[PDB]
C-alpha cells in the first residue's frame with residue numbers, strides 16, 4: 001500500500017466520468033475544511049495486516065496534527081505495483097473500517113472507480129506532506 | 137525519475153519554511169490558469185538520458201492536451217529511491233532546459249528545497265491525472 005498524507009486547509013472532489021466499466025461506488029461530491037487527505041494506492045501484497053498498519057499510522061499522524069477529519073481518497077498513480085480493482089476496493093472498505101477503530105474523528109471514504117476533479121489547499125508546515133508504505 | 141502529470145484548471149504555490157539548510161532557489165510564489173502541473177521526484181539513477189526522455193514525454197503529453205503551460209514542481213514524495221538534493225536540483229535545472237527545446241509553451245520551474253503550500257484544481261477528464269517513470 002502506498003499513501004500520500006496531505007494536511008489540507010480545504011479539500012473537495014467531484015466524480016466525473018466512470019474509470020471502470022462498473023464503478024462499485026455511486027457518483028458524488030464533497031468538500032471539507034481542515035483534513036488529512038490520504039491519497040491511497042492499494043498494492044498487490046496488501047492484506048489484513050497491511051490495512052491495520054495503515055489504519056494505526058493514519059490515526060497516529062492525525063493525532064500529532066490535531067486533525068479531526070481524514071479523507072481516504074482512492075488513487076491509482078502512487079506506485080507501479082497496483083492490486084486489481086475489486087481487491088483494491090475491498091482493501092479500501094477494510095481500511096475505512098479499521099481506521100474508525102483507531103481514530104475518533106470524521107472518516108470519509110471517497111468513491112472508488114471514477115475519474116475525479118478535486119481542489120486542495122495544502123498547508124506549508126513541515127508535516128503537511130508525507131508519504132507512507134505498508135506491507136505484510 | 138517519477139512524475140505525476142496533473143492537468144489543472146488552476147495552480148498556485150507559495151514557499152513556506154526552508155526544507156533544506158540552504159535552499160538553492162530563492163523563496164516565492166506564483167499562480168497559473170490551465171497548466172500541466174508535473175510533480176517531479178528525481179531518483180538516484182537519473183542522468184542526461186533520463187532528463188531527455190522526460191522532456192520529450194512531457195512535451196508530447198502537453199501536445200495531446202493542447203496545454204501551453206507546464207509547471208515543473210519539485211516533489212520529494214513520489215518514490216523511495218530519491219537522488220541526493222544537489223543532484224536532484226541539477227537534474228531539475230537540466231529538465232527545464234531540455235523541456236524548452238521540445239515544448240513551445242511557458243515552462244515554469246518552481247523553487248527547489250522548500251516546504252510548500254499549494255492549491256490546484258485538477259480536471260476530471262480521463263487524461264488529467266497520469267504517472268510516469270524514466271530511467272537510463
Ligand SMILES: C[C@@H](O)[C@H](N)C(=O)N[C@H]1[C@@H](O)[C@H](n2cnc3c(N)ncnc32)O[C@@H]1CO
Pocket residue numbers: 019020040041042043074075076077082083084085088111112113114115116117260265
Ligand atoms: C483517475 C483519478 O482521477 C482518480 N483519483 C483515480 O485514481 N481513480 C481510480 C481509483 O478510484 C480506482 N482504483 C483502481 N485501482 C486502484 C488501486 N489499486 N488503488 C486505489 N484506487 C484504485 O479506479 C480508478 C481508476 O484507476
Ligand SMILES: C[C@@H](O)[C@H](N)C(=O)N[C@H]1[C@@H](O)[C@H](n2cnc3c(N)ncnc32)O[C@@H]1CO
Pocket residue numbers: 124129155156176177178179210211212213218219220221224247248249250251252253
Ligand atoms: C515538502 C513539500 O511541500 C515540497 N513540495 C517538497 O517536495 N520539497 C522538496 C523539494 O523542493 C526538494 N527535494 C529534495 N530532494 C528532492 C528530490 N529527490 N526530488 C525532487 N525534489 C527534491 O527538497 C524539498 C525537501 O525534500
Ligand SMILES: [Mg+2]
Pocket residue numbers: 014015027028029
Ligand atoms: Mg456530480
Ligand SMILES: [Mg+2]
Pocket residue numbers: 150151163164165
Ligand atoms: Mg512568500
